[PDB]
């Protein structure tokens, strides 16, 4: 979280 900030 935020799931966008991790690949």
């Amino acid at each position, epitope marked *: *979280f*935020p*799931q*966008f*900030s*991790y*690949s």
Partner: single-chain antibody
Amino acid sequence: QSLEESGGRLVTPGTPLTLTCTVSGFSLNNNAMTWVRQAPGKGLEWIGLISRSGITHYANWAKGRFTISKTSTTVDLKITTSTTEDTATYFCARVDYDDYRDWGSFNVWGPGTLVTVSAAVLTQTPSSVSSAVGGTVTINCQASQSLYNNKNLAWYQQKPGQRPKLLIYSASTLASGVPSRFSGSGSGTQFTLTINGVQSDDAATYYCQGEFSCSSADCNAFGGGTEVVVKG
């Protein structure tokens, strides 16, 4: 509070091209940006997004043929190679999340920039509907997989030739300045948009949009949209 986009570009097949989205009244340091395209006469389709720290995510169709980069005030979309299938209006939009919660939605939209070159699905029904003024309109959105947080389904309105406008987010939350005659419901993989007392100004196309889990699917997708006509 506002996004600005570059002009319309008439290009040859096979030639690289960069679209710009300029941001007024916030920093991309604290905001994620997403790109969405729409070919003429057709519906919204998600391309990808850039996180606050700068991590990119693409739809599966788009991976490799689009690159999203940014500075603090501007985000870009490089089209590596341009085909006829890239003929579309490309919108940028602010991605609605912060450090505490993730609303899933896109709440500020650019005016779009036309480009003429010359799994997770949302099934949205019906494809079109006609309503008497004062009538009731239901639109259904059906996921193929549960959405991020179970409920990050948003609805947008789009009048012809105008950008999309956010109405409902997290399934049932009415956006700023949206009339209460709109309301949304559902959970899991079934959601409905209702218009109770439809008005001549409600004539538009409505898209549902769902946030999924990035590590099992495209991070977002849209329904195919519903054309709503109002008979008066």
